[model samples]
Target: LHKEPATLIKAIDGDTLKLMYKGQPMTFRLLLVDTPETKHPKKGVEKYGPEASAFTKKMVENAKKIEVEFDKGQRTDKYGRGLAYIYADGKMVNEALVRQGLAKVAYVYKPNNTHEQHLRKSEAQAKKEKLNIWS
Candidate 1:
């Protein structure tokens, strides 16, 4: 439930990233937004996976500043990756991905549902516009 400055080390896939927080590396999974899979050892790449990853990379890389806001419900997933909402260039990266149609609203976990309504609306708009993955 706290926000901290972070630096993007790399985008692991569409929704996953490696980031540096307080000089330490950490894994982060974007909250409320689920992008297409670019890398799945078992399933391989899904549709628009590469595009989603590229979009996220570009967004993070071009941002003047980045911040991570941890959720009050869950700090990390079972895999130990931090669950968070990322902000880049003063905008919520999670919502941006959904709004742009690169991602969908994925509310799998409970208690970390702060932005569900907004994300759902974004996804709906993307679907209506037939944008990116929605296309």
Candidate 2:
């Protein structure tokens, strides 16, 4: 779960991370979604380039017990891993990144999209504020 702050063992891409939780490997898909593809093998790097990874690291490095929450969904994307909204100290990391312009609101998978409106509003706010990624 991208919302859950796990020790960022490794960042797989602009949109994915290899996190460690409870001594187990966890794959987190950032909620909302954004950027195109920087780390994906078949896809070339997107706009933000390395900033996405750096932004994620800034938010998760050394953080412990990242809080996770979800609206409602199957909790898995055919991969049998739990999906959630990750937070750190009440900050919605998934959406915050987008709000901060570190990431963009790319795709909102249905049913599990409780935060779509919030994300859209956040993006608009970021654009208005001229956050890094948007600017």
Question: Highest lDDT among the candidates is held by which one?
Answer: 1
Best by TM-score: 1
What is the per-residue lDDT of model 2 for residues 1-135, given as tens digits with 9 covering 90 to 100? 234445556766556667676577888777676755667567567677577766666676546556666557776567755566766566777786777787778667678888889888988998999988778
Tens-digit lDDT track of model 1 for 67-126: 999877978899999999999988988998899998988856778987788889888998
Model 1, CA-based lDDT: 0.88
Question: By TM-score, how accurate is candidate 1?
Answer: 0.93
Model 2: residues with Cα > 4 Å off, grouped in runs = 1-8, 21-23, 79-81
TM-scores, all candidates, are 0.93, 0.78
